[PDB]
Amino acid sequence: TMAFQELSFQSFNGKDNVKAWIYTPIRKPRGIVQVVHGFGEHSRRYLHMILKFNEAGFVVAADDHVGHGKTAYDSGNWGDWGDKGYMTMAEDEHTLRKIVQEQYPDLPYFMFGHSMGSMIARGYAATHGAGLSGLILCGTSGRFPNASKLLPVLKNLIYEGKGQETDLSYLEELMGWMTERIEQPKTPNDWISSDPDIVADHANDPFNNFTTPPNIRSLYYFVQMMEIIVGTEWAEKVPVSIPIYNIAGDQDPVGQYGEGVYAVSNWLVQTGHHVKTKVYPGHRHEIHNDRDIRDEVEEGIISFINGIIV
């Protein structure tokens, strides 16, 4: 029975070695939470939350996805998620799940995802959702602006053989609008948080990446992940046995400023799911890092999980 673990497994893409960690509670384990990070960040930003989960009695598993964090640093690959399709990241989450459940086979299992991590987790719940006791979505998207238009454009560029080329202009089309509500934004990433210190730390963390853009096929995957989880057509694929906790800030462009977050909740409720939502007024994207609400955000996640375990 191992406690803290630092591990690696081969990616579904067949080339990257995914770096991952397992963090165990000192108390008798009561559950497992798998933490799925978002675009351009990495899993060790989540240490504060992970430790809180451990103190609640939860085992925590998290990896740095392909193209991200220590996985990207050790491989030198920041821009290419590979040639195996948009399911790659969900499949790598599945590999990590099987590792941690082999160690802890009888515990209730929960998946937490923030931003692209919530997109991965939503797709995961529709493809590998059996056995999930609960799903936590943070900073999630409704219909994400420009995603549906770029999807055929990028698909064509792949068919024309340009999938491994990099064109920053498509990423700017997809994400350049996100500071639209902010007066005099000091950086294009000010939508991350209204605390400039959080934005600056994100910029200065060498395991984050907003410097090397994804290549065309990886951007295609990203927009595929955005679009495959839209609507009741997606929500019906998620077993109603999985309760959902859906949280965001209402100044977050990723979730259309609260409206897209509640649209996701509605798609799920309309298809028979048990959903609990909390939108934090006046906060941008990273509600779980904003220091004035971080403890409340974490306690809410833990309360949701505890309500399911017993």
Least distance between Cl ion and beta carbon 270 (Å): 9
- Say which residues have a Cβ less than 8 Å from residue 37's Cβ, sequence separation at least 6: 43, 45, 46, 62, 64, 65, 68, 69, 114, 116, 117
Give yes or no for residue 149 binding Cl ion (CB under 5 A). Answer: no
With binding defined as CB under 5 A, does residue 27 bind Cl ion?
A: no
Interaction pattern, residues 155-184, with Cl ion; x per rule: CB under 5 A: --------x---------------------
Of all residues in the shown chain, the one whose CB is closest to Cl ion is: 163
Q: Which amino acid is at 70?
A: K
> Does position 92 bind Cl ion by CB under 5 A?
no
Strand partners, 5: 22
Angstrom distance (rounded) from CA 142 to CA 115: 11
Binding of residue 106 to Cl ion (CB under 5 A): yes
Q: Does 147 bind Cl ion (CB under 5 A)?
A: yes
Sign of CA dihedral 281, 284, 286, 290: negative
Q: Is 10 in the site for Cl ion (CB under 5 A)?
A: yes
One-letter amino acid for residue 249 of the chain = G
The closest alpha carbon to 286, from 258, 259, 247, belongs to: 247
Does 226 help bind Cl ion (rule: CB under 5 A)? yes
Give the x/- contact pattern for Cl ion in 290-309, rule: CB under 5 A: --------------------
Based on the shown chain and the rule CB under 5 A, indicate whether residue 196 belongs to the binding site for Cl ion.
Answer: yes
Q: Shortest approach of Cl ion to residue 278 CB, angstroms? A: 21
The reply on whether position 186 binds Cl ion by CB under 5 A is: yes
Distances (CA, A) of 250 to 120, 228, 259, 262: 21, 24, 8, 10
Binding residues for Cl ion (CB under 5 A):
9-10, 104, 106-107, 143-144, 147, 163, 186, 190, 196, 199, 217, 226
